[PDB]
Amino acid sequence: QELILSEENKTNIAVLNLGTNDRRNAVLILETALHLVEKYLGKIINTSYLYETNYINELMQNLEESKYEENKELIDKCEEYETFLKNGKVDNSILKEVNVENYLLECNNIIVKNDEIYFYNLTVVVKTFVNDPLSMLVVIKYIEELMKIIDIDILFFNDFTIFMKNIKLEKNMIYKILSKYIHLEPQEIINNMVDNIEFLSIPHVYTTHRYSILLCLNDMIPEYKHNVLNNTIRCLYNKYVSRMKEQYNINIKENNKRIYVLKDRISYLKEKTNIVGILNVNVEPKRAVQRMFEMINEGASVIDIGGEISERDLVVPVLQLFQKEWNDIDAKPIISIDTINYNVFKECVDNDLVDILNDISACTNNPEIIKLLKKKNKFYSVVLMHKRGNPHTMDKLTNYDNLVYDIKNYLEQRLNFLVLNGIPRYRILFDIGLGFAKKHDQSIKLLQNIHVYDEYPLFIGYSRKRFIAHCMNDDKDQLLYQKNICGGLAIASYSYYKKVDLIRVHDVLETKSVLDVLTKIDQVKDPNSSSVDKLAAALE
């Protein structure tokens, strides 16, 4: 009706899905999608992990402004989103609702019609100023077209149960949904659009049949229960998992891999133990850029730069000299800054000197540091670490109700907040903070129970810490320097077998040597040749 161009200010919960098939640019593709789902729709307030199941560089400088103000203001809750998960009282739908049974038979048909005839998933939740799914779909297919590669779909829209059959509308009607939401200053797009929306389906039809979706939704909205679906998202997912194992004898989680992004590239969760080189500037900036290189060639994937004589005077020129002498000359080290200072990180990010924030307070010193993790086109990854106190009070701040789980819950909550504020889940790393307000037997216990982080990207730092020495039994300070490095290599081995994603180390060459040998031992050609060869010997 005319109710579509209703000017009354409204807010809706817009759960989406963002697809691609290109492996090499899935990050550069889907983050570009998000920036425009953030520009032209509302606010991203949830993301799932990324899963496996040059034109764009120029476009971003010339974009059509939105008729809505962009808000980098941090929030700590969302009332509308909280209403959505519970499915309480919200406004009546703009477009006509088919009932529970009417939707079910219409769902079965569109499946069977297409049944007769790697995928890179990432779901979102958008706090949206859009009025209705079809108004959103018009903006979506317009976004799709400006990206020239991508399939953005609507998965829910509040608790709405809408199926709309035949849809075609005029070349000015489409423009009169684009005028409502976007400044328009070119027309080739509308031509492809007109019949590229044939239908509307809320919820999406594939939702409970495709695995790539029930896996993304399990991350974001596990307890959510639509009137359409037979159970909660968790329970439909956990049935699909045991169903594939029982019926077809397939571990489905084996081919559908969780991804985390450090900088530019895909990274498969639990599939590598990256070395992170410690560069501690505490002074001659020549010697330090020399050391960065020494560490790259020794095998470090990441360099963790930290100066905590001003902090920015210790870190920024050292990073500046690095960036000059690098271009002096796909092997480029990822750079993380060990700072809690907003001004230092801002300067580093605005001069493109860093890729990761390593925040040892888990962004609780200055929550506003979260803002800086996203420019107009770039996102940045973050290490969130657990601690209590400072270096002077730490050692005494040691009582926990439940050590392992309090720290885990702490970090999960911290993530939840970053996520609510549109930091993409797959860019958040967990760090238990070994030796930071932990006794030695407590640091060990955290390692004992490291499996607790099997679903998450894990960054840890054991190197040279006092707890290593506590493990050892019985020139005085020189022997203990040797034992500390060697004791560290034990923890690298442990980390390797526990599939820890990143380890933060001083002794890069030694750790690389250890990881190389362990990797070789695991590099088995024929996975069932041990039993084959066993059987051959028994038949003499």
Ligand X SMILES: Nc1nc2c(c(=O)[nH]1)N=C(CNc1ccc(S(=O)(=O)Nc3nccs3)cc1)CN2
Ligand Y SMILES: Nc1ncnc2c1ncn2[C@@H]1O[C@H](COP(=O)(O)OP(=O)(O)OP(=O)(O)O)[C@@H](O)[C@H]1O
Ligand Z SMILES: Nc1nc2c(c(=O)[nH]1)N=C(CO)CN2
Which residues of the chain form contacts with a second copy (CB under 8 A)? 297, 299, 402, 404-405, 408-409, 444, 447-449, 451, 468, 470-474, 479, 482-483, 486-487, 489-491, 493-494, 497, 509-510, 512-524, 530, 533-534, 536-537
- At residue 466, what are phi and psi to the nearest 5 degrees? -55, -30
Considering only residues 19, 42, 277, 306, which one is a binding residue for Mg ion as defined by CB under 5 A?
A: 19
Exactly one of 206, 211, 456, 459 binds ligand Y (CB under 6 A); that residue is 206
Minimum distance of ligand Z from residue 315's CB (angstroms): 42
How many CB atoms are closer than 10 A to CB 2?
5
Angle between helices 403-420 and 440-448 in degrees, nearest 10: 70
- Torsion-angle region of 539 (φ positive above 0: left; ψ -120 to 50: alpha; else: beta): alpha
Q: C-alpha 171: how far from its chain's center?
A: 38
Question: What does 466 interact with, of Ca ion, Mg ion, ligand X, none (CB < 5 to 8 A by kind)?
Answer: ligand X
CA nearest neighbour of 88 among 97, 79, 76, 96: 79
Tell whether residue 43 is a contact of Ca ion (CB under 5 A).
Answer: yes
Between CA 260 and CA 266, with CA 265 as vertex, the angle to 5 degrees is 45
Q: Which residue in this structure is represented by tokens 């107009």?
A: 376
Return the sign of the alpha-carbon dihedral for residues 86, 92, 95, 96.
positive
Q: Report if residue 151 touches Mg ion, rule: CB under 5 A.
A: yes
Does 359 help bind Ca ion (rule: CB under 5 A)? Answer: no
Interface positions, 48-77, toward ligand Z (CB under 6 A) = 53
Q: Please tell me whether 153 is known to bind a ligand.
A: yes
Q: Would you say 203 or 306 has its CB closer to ligand Y?
A: 203
Closer Cβ to ligand Y, 106 or 298, answer by number? 106
For ligand Z, the closer CB: 252 or 518: 252
Contact indicator for 486, 468 with CB cutoff of 8 Å? no
Alpha helices, DSSP H only, in 119-174?
Answer: 133-146
Residue 43 contact among ligand Z, Ca ion, a second copy, none, beta carbon within 5 to 8 Å by kind: Ca ion
Q: How many helices (H) and strands (E) does the chain have?
A: 18, 16
Residue 38 binds which of ligand X, Ca ion, Mg ion, none (CB < 5-8 A, kind-dependent): Ca ion
Break positions in the chain: residue before each gap, C to N over 2.5 angstroms? 53, 117, 148, 185, 282, 308, 329, 474
- Pick the closer one to a second copy by CB: 234 or 346: 234
Stretch 194-223 residues interacting with ligand Z (CB under 6 A): 212
In the block, tokens 């640019």 appear at 25
CB of 426 to ligand Y, least distance (A): 21
Report CA Rg, the chain. 26
Q: Which amino acid is at 325?
A: E
Residue 287 CB, nearest approach to a second copy (Å): 19
154 part of the interface to ligand Y, by CB under 6 A = yes
CB of residue 43 to Ca ion, shortest distance in Å: 5
Residue 231 is classified by DSSP as S
Choose among a second copy, Ca ion, ligand Y, none what residue 331 binds, the Cβ cut-off being 5 to 8 Å by kind.
Answer: none
151 binds, among Ca ion, Mg ion, ligand X, none (CB under 5 to 8 A by kind): Mg ion
* 130: DSSP letter: -
Residue ranges of the annotated binding site for Ca(2+) are 38, 42, 70
| Interface contacts to ligand Z, rule CB under 6 A | 19, 53, 119, 121, 151, 212
Residue ranges of the annotated binding site are 38, 42, 70, 141, 144, 151, 153-154, 196-199, 201, 204, 206, 210, 507, 510
